Amino acid sequence: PSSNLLEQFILLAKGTSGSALTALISQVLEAPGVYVFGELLELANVQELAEGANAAYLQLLNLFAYGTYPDYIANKESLPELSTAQQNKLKHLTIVSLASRMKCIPYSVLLKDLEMRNLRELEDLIIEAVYTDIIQGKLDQRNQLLEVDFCIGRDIRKKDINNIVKTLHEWCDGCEAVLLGIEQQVLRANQYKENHNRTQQQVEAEVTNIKKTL
């Protein structure tokens, strides 16, 4: 029901705004379920908050859209104080960014990036993220590694579109190269078959010539 709640707040943001909108955004950051905040940022009333006097909540929402937990720690003076749900949601989002790059996350990296001291609560944060359909994977406690098979994505500052295009172009070029290699292998196999047929026809011609000789 997060998407339905997200759409209702989008409809409400088209009307009422101001301090109510900032409190509404804070409720979004506290209500579990919402893992995508790009749709909220596209609203014109968010841009109204840009020129408005209040900016702590907008910088808070902006960080949840693109930034991670370590950025929020540095901005403890400029961002509104978060709740337990808000901190957990940001930590889950930070894990999403970490799991997006590397599919195997050692426990050392987990304890470092999320200000994680106790490993027991680290497991609780990890299992909570998995159980809410955020990340999919398996945990390796002997090697202290977090193997993530599948994870959700994140929003883009319109600057990663170029990276997406470059990656798609590289994939297309690789596919074309493999297709050309397969065609070359097929041609080589056809040439080998032709050589074998030429050897067979030479043998049969030699046999027929000797038969005619005798």
Using CB under 8 A as the binding criterion, the count of chain residues that bind other proteins stands at: 15
- Binder to other proteins among 170, 176, 194, 204 (CB under 8 A)? 170
Helices and strands (H, E) in the chain, number of each type = 10, 3
Which one of 138, 181, 203, 204 is in contact with other proteins (CB under 8 A)?
A: 181
Q: Which of 8, 141, 167, 201 binds other proteins (CB under 8 A)?
A: 167
- Is residue 189 a contact point for other proteins (CB under 8 A)? yes
What backbone phi and psi angles, to 5 degrees, belong to 54? -75, 130
Which CB, 179 or 207, lies closer to other proteins? 179
Pairing mode of beta strands 135-140, 104-106? unpaired
Structure tokens at 158: 């319109």
Q: CA 38 → CA 66, 113, 202, distances in Å?
A: 9, 24, 72
Nearer to other proteins, 70 or 181 (CB): 181
Cα gap 82→63, rounded to integer Å: 12
Binding site for other proteins (CB under 8 A): 167, 170-171, 174-175, 178, 181-182, 185, 188-189, 192-193, 196, 199
